[PDB]
Amino acid sequence: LADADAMHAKALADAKAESEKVTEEAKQDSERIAAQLSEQAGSEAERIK
Amino acid sequence: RAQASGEVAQTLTQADQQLSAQGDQVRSGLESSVDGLSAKLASRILGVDVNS
């Protein structure tokens, strides 16, 4: 039971760490997607010009 | 892209208006010149330099 509680705590800590890491990775992915979408929009605008 | 299309249409219409004015005001200018072209064509076809 003591080991199970300790493993619960350790797994919860690793879980929150993984959640934060994936959130940061998703934020970076969203930044890249927004940047490339804006660049593509600029390319489309100049093509229309 | 919608804004770009709108401004492209705007510049297109302004350019079309200015080009129409240009053509209208250059037709009169070349009206005097076309007489020389006609006279020279007549000279070539006739085989002699027709002055009229």
Resolution at which this structure was determined, Å: 2.8
Residue B27 token pair = 């037709």
Test B1 with A44 for CB contact under 8 angstroms.
Answer: yes
Q: What is the DSSP string of chain A?
A: -HHHHHHHHHHHHHHHHHHHHHHHHHHHHHHHHHHHHHHHHHHHHHHH-
Cβ neighbours of A49 in B, within 8 Å: 4, 8
The nearest alpha carbon in chain A to B2 belongs to: A45
A2–B contact, CB cutoff 8 A: no
Question: At B1, which helix (H) or strand (E)?
Answer: none
Q: Determined by which method?
A: cryo-EM
First and final CA of chain B: distance in angstroms?
59
> Inter-chain contact B1–A49, Cβ cutoff 8 Å?
no
The conformation of residue B47, written as its DSSP 8-state character, comes to S
Q: In whole angstroms, what is the distance from residue A28 CA to residue A24 CA?
A: 6
Under DSSP, the state recorded for B48 is S
Query: In angstroms, rounded to a whole number, what is the distance separating the alpha carbons of residues A30 and A23?
Result: 10
Cβ–Cβ < 8 Å for B8, A48: yes
From chain A residues 4-43, the ones with a CB under 8 A of any chain B CB are 41
